[PDB]
Each structure stands twice: as C-alpha cells, then as structure tokens.
Amino acid sequence: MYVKLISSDGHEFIVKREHALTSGTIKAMLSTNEVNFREIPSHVLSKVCMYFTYKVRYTNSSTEIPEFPIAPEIALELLMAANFLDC
Amino acid sequence: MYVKLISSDGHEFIVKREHALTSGTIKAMLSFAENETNEVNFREIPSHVLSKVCMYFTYKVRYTNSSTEIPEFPIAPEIALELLMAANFLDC
Amino acid sequence: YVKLISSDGHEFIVKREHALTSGTIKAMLSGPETNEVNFREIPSHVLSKVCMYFTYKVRYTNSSTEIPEFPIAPEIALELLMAANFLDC
Amino acid sequence: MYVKLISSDGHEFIVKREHALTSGTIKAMLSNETNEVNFREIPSHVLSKVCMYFTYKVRYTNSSTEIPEFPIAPEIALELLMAANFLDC
Amino acid sequence: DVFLMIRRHKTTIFTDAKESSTVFELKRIVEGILKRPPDEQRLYKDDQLLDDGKTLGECGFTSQTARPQAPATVGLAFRADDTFEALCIEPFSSPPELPDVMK
Amino acid sequence: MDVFLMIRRHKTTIFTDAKESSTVFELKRIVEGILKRPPDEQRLYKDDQLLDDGKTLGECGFTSQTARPQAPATVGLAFRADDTFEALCIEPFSSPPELPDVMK
Amino acid sequence: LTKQMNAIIDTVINYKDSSGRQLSEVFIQLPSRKELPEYYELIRKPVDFKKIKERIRNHKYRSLGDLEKDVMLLCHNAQTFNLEGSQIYEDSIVLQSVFKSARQKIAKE
Amino acid sequence: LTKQMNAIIDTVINYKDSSGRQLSEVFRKELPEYYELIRKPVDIKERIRNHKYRSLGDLEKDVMLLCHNAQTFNLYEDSIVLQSVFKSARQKIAKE
Amino acid sequence: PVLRSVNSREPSQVIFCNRSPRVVLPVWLNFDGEPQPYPTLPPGTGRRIHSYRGHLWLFRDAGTHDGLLVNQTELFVPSLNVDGQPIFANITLPVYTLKERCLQVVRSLVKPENYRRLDIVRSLYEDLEDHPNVQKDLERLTQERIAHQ
Amino acid sequence: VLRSVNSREPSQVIFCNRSPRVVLPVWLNFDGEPQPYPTLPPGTGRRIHSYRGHLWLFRDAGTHDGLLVNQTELFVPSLNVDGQPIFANITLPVYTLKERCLQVVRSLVKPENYRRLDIVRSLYEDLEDHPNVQKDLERLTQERIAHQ
Amino acid sequence: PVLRSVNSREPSQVIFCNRSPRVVLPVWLNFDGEPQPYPTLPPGTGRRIHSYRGHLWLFRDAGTHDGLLVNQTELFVPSLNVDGQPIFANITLPVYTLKERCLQVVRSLVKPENYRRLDIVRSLYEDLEDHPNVQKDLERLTQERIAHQRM
Amino acid sequence: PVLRSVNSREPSQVIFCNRSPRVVLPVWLNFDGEPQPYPTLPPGTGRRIHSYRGHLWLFRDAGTHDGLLVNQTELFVPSLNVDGQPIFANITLPVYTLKERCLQVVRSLVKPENYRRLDIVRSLYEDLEDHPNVQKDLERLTQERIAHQR
Ligand SMILES: Cc1ncsc1-c1ccc([C@H](C)NC(=O)[C@@H]2C[C@@H](O)CN2C(=O)[C@@H](c2cc(O[C@@H](C)CN3CC[C@@H](N4CCN5c6cc(-c7ccccc7O)nnc6NC[C@H]5C4)C3)no2)C(C)C)cc1
Ligand SMILES: Cc1ncsc1-c1ccc([C@H](C)NC(=O)[C@@H]2C[C@@H](O)CN2C(=O)[C@@H](c2cc(O[C@@H](C)CN3CC[C@@H](N4CCN5c6cc(-c7ccccc7O)nnc6NC[C@H]5C4)C3)no2)C(C)C)cc1
Ligand SMILES: Cc1ncsc1-c1ccc([C@H](C)NC(=O)[C@@H]2C[C@@H](O)CN2C(=O)[C@@H](c2cc(O[C@@H](C)CN3CC[C@@H](N4CCN5c6cc(-c7ccccc7O)nnc6NC[C@H]5C4)C3)no2)C(C)C)cc1
C-alpha cells in the first residue's frame, strides 16, 4: 500500500510502504499507516523520503549509480535524522 | 611537426602531420622521396568541408583505442553529402 | 604456532616458522610433530628476548630500505649469548 | 663575511654574506658594498625564518644524504610567501 | 583537454591545450608553428581580448564546449608597428541550401 | 604499517604482528585462534586502559616506532568468568642478575 | 626402496588439497635464472621435484632420510624466498606435512 | 644484383645516427599484440639468398612494409629514418 | 563452425552495458554459428543476462545494423564465473571511418529510392545501397581468423 | 585467504571509473596486503596489465569510501579468452543514508571540530571511524567464512 | 623524443628507496616518452622492482605532484646490472626555493577554489593555481638537455 | 686473485651513503685483490667519491671490523655511469645472527683479558676472542663465488 510520515511542523509525506521499510526504525514502528516524528522538520523528512526513492530504484542496478546529493545547509540535521531512522 | 591543407576557396588548415596521415590519399601524396612536403591542395574540396575533415582527424586520433566510452562523430545534414564525397576521395 | 616454555615456566606462543630460525629448535621439533618445547636452563627474561630476535630476523631479512640495530642491554648480554649459543640463533 | 638584515619592528639579523646572497633582491641591494639592509615591510617572525632558509639552502644544496623538509607553520605561511617572492629566495 | 581552432584571416590552426594552461603558453605554441614571437600576437575568445596571464579555463574555454569534433574558436591578430590588426577571421565556404531529399 | 605485539595474560605470552590499520577486534580473533576463547570473553588492555573492539591499533597508540619487532608493544589480556572479568594480571618475566663488575 | 622412494615422491606430487587443485604444479620444475634471477641469488641450493626423481632414477638418495633432507631443503628454500602467507609458502608447509605422512605409511606398514 | 642488394641492406643495418647508436639493433609468446595488429610480419637477408625478390623494387616493397608495420603498432622515428637511409642507399648503389 | 558458441553446459552470469548512443541488438551465435537476434538494449542501459560460458556474442545498432564494439573488440565470449562475479560486456561505438560514418548519416536522411538523386559517383551509390550486415561481417571475421592461423 | 595468486599468465584488464569520484585501485599482493596503485579520474578508463587470479579492490582515493566493481566488492580477472580484455566497471554503491551523511559531514568539518556539532555521542564516534581498506578486508573474510 | 625509455630486453633489478617524508609516485617514461604512473612508495620504505637497462624513470609527491630527486638528480636510468647486484635509486626531497616551498604549504592548507579569497597579489594567486606538473617539467628538462648539447 | 678490482681507466662517480649506526670503513680491493683501508664515513653521512668502473669495494664497522652490507650485498662494484648521474652505494647493518650480535655486545663491554672471567663454555670464549676479519670473510666469499651460484 502507501504510508504517511508526518514532520514536526506537521507536513504529511505519503510514500510506498516498501520505500519506507528501508528504515529499520520505521519497519519496527509498523510491526498502522501513520508515523509522527516530533523532532524531524519537513525539509529533512522530505529528503529522507527522496533517499527511499533513490535506494529502492538504484539498489541492484548494474551499469551506473549517481551520487545521492546532500547540501551543506541540510547535512547535519539529515545525519541526525538518518541515524534515528536507521536508513 | 604540422602540415598545411588548402581548400578550393583557398583557406589554409594547419593540422599535426600524424592527424592528416589518417587519410590514405594524403599519406600517399606526402609519403620526390628525399624529404617531406608541407602543403597539399584540394581543388574540389571547399573550406566548410575540409574544416570538418580536420575535425574528424582530431576525433579519430583522440578516441581511437580510448577504453571506457567514445562519442558519436556528429555530421549536420547541410554538410553530409559533400563530406561523404570528400571522405571517399580522402580515404579517411 | 609453537609453544616455547622457560625454566621459571613462562609460556611463549610464536609462529612455527619464526621459531625454526633456531637450528636447535628445528632439531627438537623435526625429530619425534609436537607443539611444545621446554628449556630447563633458559629463564623468561632471556627466552622472551630470543623470540624478539625471531620477530626481528624474520621481518628484516631481505629488507631493501635499511635495517635497525638489534639492541641488547648489558644486564641481559651474557645469559642471551649463552642462550644464543645453545640455540643455533 | 657577515651582513646585517634589519626587520620592520627593528630586530637585527647578522648572517654570513654568502648565506644572504641566496636572495637575488639582497644580491642586487649589496652589489663598494654595504653591511646593513633594512626591510620596512618584513616583520621579525618572518625575516628570522627567511635567514633559517639561507642556513638550510646553503647547507643541504649538493648533499648526497637525504634532505629534510623545510618546515613552515600555517600562521607564518602567507607572510613568508610574500617575503619569499620580494626576496627572490 | 581543450580543443581549439586558432584563426587569423584565412589561416586556421587546429590544436589542443590544457584548461589549466595559459593564454601566454598558447602564444608560444603559435610562435613554434608560425615563427611569430609571443608579444605581437593578440588572442580573442569571441570579441573579448585574453590576458597572457589567465588560464584558458578562466577565459571561458572548457572541455565540454571545446570538444575535438566541435573545437572552440580563438581569434588571432598580429601587430604592425604601434597599431593592432583588427580581429579579422574571414569565414569558411558556405554549404548549399538543404537538398529537398532530406526535408 | 606493521605493529609487533606481545599479548600477555598471566604466564602466557603470544608474539604476533598486525597492521596499524587493523582493529582491536581482529587481534581478539587471533587470540581466539590460539587460546580458544571468543572475542566477547576477552578484554584487551594497553597498559591499564581498555581497548574498544572498533578502534584501529594505530588509534589505540601502537605506532610502528613503539611496536618494533625487537621491542614489541605489550597488549594485556583478561578472560571472562561468568558475570565478571578476571583482573588484568601479567606475571613478570625473570629478573636479570646484578650487573657484573666486569661490564662496569 | 626405489619403489617406496617413487611412492613417497609420487604421493607428494599427485597430492591435491580439498578444492581439487594440485600443489606440486609450481614445485615440478624450477624457473630459468634469465626468468627469475632474485630467487637464485637468495637460494643456496636450487632443487625441484624432478631434480629429486632424477636423483631417485639415478638412486642418488642413499636412505629415506637423505631423500627427506632435500625435500625439506626446497620446501624451506621456497619459504625463505616467498612472502609469508603466499600461495606457494603455505603449500611447501603442506608438502613437508604430506611427505612426513607419506614416508611414515610406506617405510613402516 | 645480389652484391648490390647486400650493399643496400647492410648499409641500412650498419647505419648509426649522430649519437653513435645503431638503429637496426631492435630488428608471439613474448608480445602477442604485434601478432594480432600487424598483418605480414618479418624480422630480410633470408629472401636475398633464396632470390625471392626479383628486382630492387621488390626488396624496397618489404623494407617499407617492415618500417610501416612498426609505425602502425607503436604510437617509430627510426623506421622513418630507416626508410630515408634505404631510399638514399638504393639511389647510390643502383645508379653510380 | 569456425565462429560459433560451444556447448559448455556451464552457466555464465553476464552484464550487457550499452554505453553507445544507439539502441543495441545483442546477437548470439548458436552452436552451428548462425546469428540469433535477442531483445534490444536502449542507450545508457545495463541488464544482467543468464548465459553459458564459451558462448559467443556480437552487438549491433538494432536500426541500421551498424557494427558496435564490446570491451574494445568485435566479439564477446564470457569467461567461466570466478566466485560468482558477473562478467561485464561494455558495448560502445567504434571509431567509424569518416566515409562509413558519412554513409550512415546520408542513409539516415535520404530514402533508399532517392540515393539515385544524389550527384555522387556510382561506386558511392553502390556503397550507400550496401547496408551493413551481420552475415557479410561474420564471413570477413572468419577470413581474418584463417589469416591469423 | 584473500590474496592474489602468483600465476605467470597475463590478464589484460580495463579499469573503467564510472563513479563521480577519483578511484584508488588497490591490488592485494600474494601475502594479502593492500597495495595502493595510480588513481583513475572520474569518467576515465585505462587498459592495465595484470595477471590471472590477481585480486583487486577499488576506493575513493580522497575519503577511502568503499566502491563496487561489476556489482561486487572484489575483482579477479578470469583467464582472457582469445586475447580479448576483461572489463572492471567501477561504480558508487548505494550507501546507507547515514553512511552517506557521515561522508558529507566528514568532508565539510575538520576532525577536531566533530566535537562542536550538537549531535549524539554515538554519532561523534561514527564520524571519527573513517572508512578503511583493512577494516573492510577483515569484514569480507568473516563474510567468506560465513559462506563456508 | 629526447627523454624516453629504450627497449632493451636486458632486465635491470633496481631498489626504489623513498628517503623523502612524502608518498612517492614513481613515473616510468615509456618508449614514446609518455609518463606512466606506477604504484606509490610510502615514506621510509624500499622495494626491489623489475625494470630494464636504459629505461628512464622520474619520481614525484603522489599527492601534490611536487618534484623529487633520485641520486641527487631529476631522472634515474638503471645502469647495466653487474654480478646480479641490484642498482639503488635513492629518492629524496630537493632543496625547494623558499617561494615554491611556501606555495606548497599554502596549497596544502587552502582548498583550491579558495586560493581566490587570499589577500595576496594576483601574480601569487596565479603561482598558487599553477599546480606542479610532470609534463611541464619534462618540457623544461628537454630544453635543458638541448642547451648542454648546443655549445 | 678471483676477487679483485679491474684496471678500467674509465672513472665512475659514486655516493657512499652510511645508513648504519656504525662508523663505516670503506675497503677498496686493489687489482691484486688486497684490501686497502679508506677514510671512515660517520654514521648517517653521504659523500661523493671518485672511483673507477669495475673497482670492487667492501664496507665494515671501523671500530669492531664487523661486516656491513651495501645495496643488500657484501660487495659493491660501480656500474659505468649513465649521463654523468652518480651511482649510489647504500651501506646498512646486516641481520646479524643473535649469537654473533651477542658476541659484539659482550666484546664491547668486557676487556679481552676478562673474557676468561665469564662463566661460559670454552668454545664460546674462543668465539669471543675470534674478532671478525676482512681477510677471513674475503676467503669465504671466494669459495662462495668459485661456486658459480649461492
Ligand atoms: C597505470 C595504472 N593505473 C591504474 S592501475 C595502473 C597500473 C597497474 C599495474 C602496473 C604494473 C605494470 N603492473 C602491476 O603492478 C601488476 C598488477 C597486479 O596484477 C600485480 N602486478 C605486478 O606487476 C606484480 C607481479 C608481476 C608478476 O609477474 C609474475 C608472473 C612473474 N613471476 C616470475 C615468473 C613467475 N614465477 C616463477 C617462479 N615461481 C616460483 C617458483 C618457486 C619454486 C618452484 C619449484 C621449486 C622451488 C621453488 O622455490 N618458488 N618461488 C616462486 N616464485 C615466483 C613463482 C612464479 C611469476 N607477478 O606479480 C608485481 C608488481 C609484484 C602499472 C600501473
Ligand atoms: C611494485 C612497484 N612498485 C613501485 S614501481 C613497481 C613495479 C615495478 C615493475 C613492474 C613490472 C613487473 N615491470 C615493469 O612494469 C617494467 C618497468 C619499466 O622498466 C617498464 N616495464 C615493463 O614491463 C614494460 C616493458 C617490458 C619490456 O620487455 C620487453 C621484452 C618488451 N618488448 C620491448 C617493447 C616491445 N617491443 C618489441 C619489439 N617490437 C618491434 C620488433 C620489431 C622487430 C624485431 C626484430 C626483427 C624484426 C622486427 O620488425 N620491429 N618493430 C617493433 N616495434 C614494436 C616493438 C615493441 C616488447 N619492455 O618494456 C611494459 C610495461 C611495456 C610493475 C610494478
Ligand atoms: C674521502 C673518502 N671518504 C671515504 S672513501 C674517500 C675517498 C675515496 C677515493 C679517493 C681517491 C680520490 N680515489 C681513489 O683512491 C680511487 C678509489 C678506488 O676506485 C681506487 N682509486 C685510486 O685512486 C687507485 C687508482 C686506480 C687507478 O687506475 C689507474 C688508471 C691508475 N694508474 C694508471 C696506470 C695504472 N696501472 C695499471 C697496471 N699497470 C700494469 C699492469 C700490468 C699487467 C696487467 C695485467 C696483466 C699483466 C700485467 O703485466 N703490468 N704492469 C703494470 N705497470 C703499470 C701499471 C699501471 C695505475 N687510478 O687510481 C689508486 C689508489 C691505485 C679519495 C677519498
């Protein structure tokens, strides 16, 4: 199906279930289509999803993989979010 | 060491000797058998063609035996036929 | 690996090849293979250093760059010379 | 045989004439010939190190033995580069 | 990694040079070929004069716009006494109108 | 580079090499190979400080210039008894005789 | 005796490890000095596994302790020259262990 | 003709450049890449004794083939000089 | 039988990587050595394909039947897999002769019935009409292998 | 266990760097010690002379980050068939979002300043644990003793 | 190609000894005289390498591409081996000019995109941006060989 | 005289580089193969010296007469210089046997008249007394060189 991730500022992110499960911590929480992150802002949780999109698509792709970009401005908060999520 | 190719309309093209030799016809014309000739004159090849013939020499020399990936040598429709003519004459 | 045991009864576990640098150990092991050899007249502070030589010899033999001096303190020199003589090296 | 280089802050550096001449700019300023030269825009912590280079260059040029790295601390690097270029060292 | 056509009047020189190499080094290459010393040559990228001290890179020439098949054009002017020769690159012969067969 | 070690517990002394870049964990695995006790039953100390399984020998302090083949650096070993680990105990090597007057 | 020397020496050569690969394949014939000069400078007594059967065909070996003395010499010559933990090093460690079990089966059974 | 053919082939071999070095000195297990890229391999006197070359233009055709098969394989100048020293050596012996 | 697959019975995992700008037609030579067309690779794509060792492959522009290269050569024969590692077939443009390249472009712009309208030599017209062809090229490749033998 | 094998049989190979990074080819020697080799700039390819059974490994020369060759971690050239060269296609792996973030932070912040970031203590340790050929070789061995 | 290896087929055993504080990139000039990078030597190591008689080598700081010396000169060409004895290539720092040395340090501390931000003269900025380079140095070495072979 | 310099008359510039802890005594073999002592190299020093092609050299601890190594070998013979580039003689400690190394240390600490006071075997006492020696070592090197290989 799909799953709803909700940021601190209260943005809703609807992403495929399998995309989300790339996160061990989400996998744990869904084990229910909703999860709320009180400490993750949208500009971060938005990019966390973009990674799910990336990981799902390019895992087991033979020819070439493109670098998953992270801007300096977001790097630290993403690293925090990343570690919390286990993605 | 370089070589001078001169078009019908009288443009001069100075290109490396080795680049030019990619053409059998040119190799023949260059190789009195005591010493080397710098100029060769093409009565029936215009500049907009002979210019592109050189660009091929540049391309061929550079990308021959290059390992990962070679790009397609582009030819615009406007030049295609005259280049094909020139190409066949040159043996490049 | 091989086990060398000093008079006082310390155990030294060193690579077999490292130990074989000693012709006398080669003899004791190669002639009945066992893992242990016992030195009733070699104390630990000596047999410890004898191993350190094996480490050194094995490492720096056939070395292109430069080799450093194998140090021996006066206090140990005589007993080591004895041990060294008794062992091929 | 000796020559006096004087920094902006007014430190005096007495160095062998030949050591100083390693600098084209100084060679020019000296080439009778004077004993002092004054650098109004070079501070001591820099001109001190410029001399240390003369010492180094003179000593280790033409040495069969391995040459050691001429160290430069970050804090000094830029001003030294400036001074270096002016001097032609 | 940069491919160039250096053109003055009816002469065109096809040559490579590094992005990191300098406008001066290019003048020296021309000196080597046409036997004309570096200081009387003036090199243009389009209509802007290039400083001897700048790298081809900083002038605007890049690997992605100076490919061997589509060389970037450096304009050339010589010096007669005090005056500067005008940037004059007499164009190549023109291709015939696109044949009706290809439309 | 290469680091030369004496891993010592009680009267046992293991002579082995590793890389500066290799880890405290793989060193526990070498010990496992010899003394037949897994890395989760072993504690490795440099002097009196405990070494984390994840740190490189380099980061622990074993440099090429303190772990030379002829001056091996000493790593202390402790084994687990049930709920507790034994004290780090390295019985000292035999003392050398007082320096003979001939060598003075 | 020559038959036992042929058995002991042929068992060590024919011996394959537990992946099916024959170990003696490198130890069959030594390299030419032209090929590998460093080995000859390092090694006092270059001997291979043919040089040993040649001796055995000539019956140059007197006892089974003289055949062993020169199988240990090449297997130890290999160890000296090669890097510790190399493919060739640990097989001369196995070829000494397969010769010491092959002589112990033929000479006393 | 055999005396003339030997004078030309021996002059090209014996020919040293202006540093004293002999150029001809260079001339499948070892280098399989020549034995994949060059069509008609050769290492020349053999065919002067067997009389396979009928004229001084047939001896030249295979010295140009050997010098050109060298230029092809390697991205060289001595095979450019050995063609220039063969074309001056044949021009002195065959007409003087 | 000269240029043919071999009945190895041993499977080889392969990665066809199309780094040409063209749609690529993989062509497997069967045991008799007859070209067998396989599904096309779009430009800039890569696929893992089950194959067997000793099998002989060959790649071409699915449209024009123009010659391509695999690992800087004309034929690809997969090695036996080492430790499960998939062998890699890197498919690229060759450096076409200026002539052959021009033919390609003219052929792509002018309908074959109009080749007759081009003010060119008859020999060039014949060359244009001659379209590249797997079989012609296979015949050439054999004579190039009997010339090495 | 993980080492080159002295072979005497040449195997020509093509190292193709299809990563955005400068690639450090790492040849395991016969004793199995990593040996750094000349770097490949991004988007380049070279023909290199190697031997059959020789084991290679690739990494970001700058960061020592892990790369992949033919969708796996180790490359061992097979015997050449008919002289044609074997191809080593070097690419980014799909890094975990965490490991990827670490990469970026590590690249922006001096190691002595990792302590100034308002992050969890565990993350400080993770930041400090820079990737490493030897650590990864140890892991790859246990992954091959686990397949046995 | 004035500076190039000579195909010889006579092997010459050599010992590359890195006596610089830097990681050393050995660079073999091929027969056409094109630089060919080889495996790096860590500081303070020595390795026996197989090269041939007449083969021409060159050494550099693998990182910075800074110029090094071998037997107190710039090029190394192995002598014919006598009696199996290996030849020795002793690789060391040269005495860099104070300027060039300063550039090295600044270059090592500042990211190349920031050279632009340094409050120094443009000429110094150009010098900073002019990274050292094997090819530039090879061109110079050729003119230095045609200058002692002119006279 | 198997082991001897050869009268070349072609000069060979050489660099003696002492990378041993020991003061080094360079020893030039004469054409009659006779050792000829030369000026000592201090530890960690390097000097350019004028020698000739084919001339055979040998190095030793100037004090103890202990054996050293040059370019991983016992003998150094300069090749003919290429392009004036100087040849390099890298002088280093060898891997001494633990015994020989111990002897070295004991010999350095105990006066020779006191070797008699050490509670050691008589054979060891003789070994202590038997100082290392260039000539003994030259004789050994000849028999090992008269064997075409080693
Ligand atoms: C530009 C660029 N960019 C990105 S990367 C790169 C690049 C990459 C590479 C290079 C350079 C040019 N290439 C390399 O570095 C390559 C790469 C990697 O593949 C290893 N390698 C090497 O060069 C090693 C190497 C070479 C070698 O060649 C053997 C076949 C030669 N050996 C003697 C002949 C046989 N030996 C014969 C005796 N045999 C033994 C026998 C015995 C023995 C037998 C019987 C009885 C008693 C005995 O003792 N004992 N020992 C023996 N040892 C040898 C064995 C086999 C093989 N092998 O490895 C080099 C570097 C180490 C440049 C740029
Ligand atoms: C570990 C480590 N760490 C830090 S560095 C390092 C390291 C060290 C060493 C290596 C490896 C093991 N060693 C090397 O890489 C060394 C180093 C450097 O010195 C070059 N080299 C090489 O291996 C080159 C090499 C090998 C070679 O051996 C000749 C037999 C090869 N031949 C001549 C060049 C061809 N020519 C053959 C005639 N051929 C022609 C022949 C004729 C002809 C002849 C006779 C009669 C008629 C004829 O027509 N005509 N024309 C010819 N033209 C072409 C020419 C080509 C083969 N020489 O060089 C390799 C790299 C090329 C690794 C790491
Ligand atoms: C500072 C520092 N620190 C650490 S070390 C050091 C240092 C190092 C060196 C030096 C100094 C500057 N350098 C040296 O000392 C160098 C070094 C070492 O390489 C030898 N050598 C010398 O100087 C000897 C030397 C030899 C020689 O070569 C002849 C051309 C010189 N002479 C002309 C002619 C010849 N004779 C040759 C037989 N010849 C005869 C031959 C025969 C004969 C031969 C074969 C068969 C049958 C025969 O009958 N018969 N008769 C002969 N009579 C004539 C004789 C002539 C000698 N040049 O120099 C010196 C010491 C001998 C300084 C510091």
Swiss-Prot record, chain C:
Subunit structure and binding partners: Heterotrimer of an A (ELOA, ELOA2 or ELOA3P), ELOB and ELOC subunit. The elongin BC complex interacts with EPOP; leading to recruit the elongin BC complex to Polycomb group (PcG) target genes, thereby restricting excessive activity of the PRC2/EED-EZH2 complex.
Role of this protein: SIII, also known as elongin, is a general transcription elongation factor that increases the RNA polymerase II transcription elongation past template-encoded arresting sites. Subunit A is transcriptionally active and its transcription activity is strongly enhanced by binding to the dimeric complex of the SIII regulatory subunits B and C (elongin BC complex). Core component of multiple cullin-RING-based ECS (ElonginB/C-CUL2/5-SOCS-box protein) E3 ubiquitin-protein ligase complexes, which mediate the ubiquitination of target proteins. By binding to BC-box motifs it seems to link target recruitment subunits, like VHL and members of the SOCS box family, to Cullin/RBX1 modules that activate E2 ubiquitination enzymes. Component the von Hippel-Lindau ubiquitination complex CBC(VHL).
Tissue specificity remark: Overexpressed in prostate cancer cell line PC-3 and breast cancer cell line SK-BR-3.
Intracellular or extracellular location(s): Nucleus
Lineage top rank: taxon: Eukaryota
Pathway(s) this gene product operates in, as recorded in its UniProt entry: Protein modification; protein ubiquitination
Record-given protein name: Elongin-C
Membrane found in the keyword field: no
Family indicated by similarity: Belongs to the SKP1 family.
Gene: ELOC
Principal place of residence: nucleus
Curated annotation (Swiss-Prot), chain E:
Keyword Nucleotide-binding: no
Modified residues (Phosphothreonine): 83
GO cellular component: Cul2-RING ubiquitin ligase complex; Cul5-RING ubiquitin ligase complex; cytosol; elongin complex; nucleoplasm; VCB complex
GO MF, one example: ubiquitin protein ligase binding
Biochemical pathway: Protein modification; protein ubiquitination
Localization (cell): Nucleus
Record CDD domains: Ubl_ElonginB
Gene name tied to this protein: ELOB
Assembly information from the UniProt record: Heterotrimer of an A (ELOA, ELOA2 or ELOA3P), ELOB and ELOC subunit. The elongin BC complex interacts with EPOP; leading to recruit the elongin BC complex to Polycomb group (PcG) target genes, thereby restricting excessive activity of the PRC2/EED-EZH2 complex. (Microbial infection) Following infection by HIV-1 virus, component of a cullin-5-RING E3 ubiquitin-protein ligase complex (ECS complex) hijacked by the HIV-1 Vif protein.
This protein's UniProt keywords: Acetylation, Host-virus interaction, Nucleus, Phosphoprotein, Transcription, Transcription regulation, Ubl conjugation pathway
Protein name: Elongin-B
Domain (Ubiquitin-like): residue spans on this chain: 1-65
Family: Belongs to the Elongin B family.
Curated annotation (Swiss-Prot), chain H:
Binding residue positions for Zn(2+): 51, 68
Post-translational modification: During apoptosis, cleaved by cathepsin CTSG to produce a 160 kDa cleavage product which localizes to the cytosol.
Subcellular location: Nucleus
Sequence ranges assigned to domain Bromo in this UniProt record: 1-93
Role noted for this protein: ATPase involved in transcriptional activation and repression of select genes by chromatin remodeling (alteration of DNA-nucleosome topology). Component of SWI/SNF chromatin remodeling complexes that carry out key enzymatic activities, changing chromatin structure by altering DNA-histone contacts within a nucleosome in an ATP-dependent manner. Binds DNA non-specifically. Belongs to the neural progenitors-specific chromatin remodeling complex (npBAF complex) and the neuron-specific chromatin remodeling complex (nBAF complex).
UniProt subunit comment: Component of the multiprotein chromatin-remodeling complexes SWI/SNF: SWI/SNF-A (BAF), SWI/SNF-B (PBAF) and related complexes. The canonical complex contains a catalytic subunit (either SMARCA4/BRG1/BAF190A or SMARCA2/BRM/BAF190B, mutually exclusive) and at least SMARCE1, ACTL6A/BAF53, SMARCC1/BAF155, SMARCC2/BAF170, and SMARCB1/SNF5/BAF47. Other subunits specific to each of the complexes may also be present permitting several possible combinations developmentally and tissue specific.
Family under the similarity heading: Belongs to the SNF2/RAD54 helicase family.
Whole-protein coverage range: 1383 to 1509 of 1590
Curated annotation (Swiss-Prot), chain I:
Effect of residue 101 to P: In PCC and VHLD; type I
Effect of residue 71 to T: In VHLD; type I
MF term (GO), any: transcription elongation factor activity
Effect of residue 16 to S: In VHLD; type I
Protein name: von Hippel-Lindau disease tumor suppressor
Impact reported for residue 57 to C: In VHLD; type I
Effect recorded for residue 54 to R: In VHLD; type I-II
Result after altering residue 96 to D: In VHLD; type I
Known outcome of mutating residue 101 to G: In VHLD; type II
Residue numbers spanned by region Involved in binding to CCT complex: 40-95
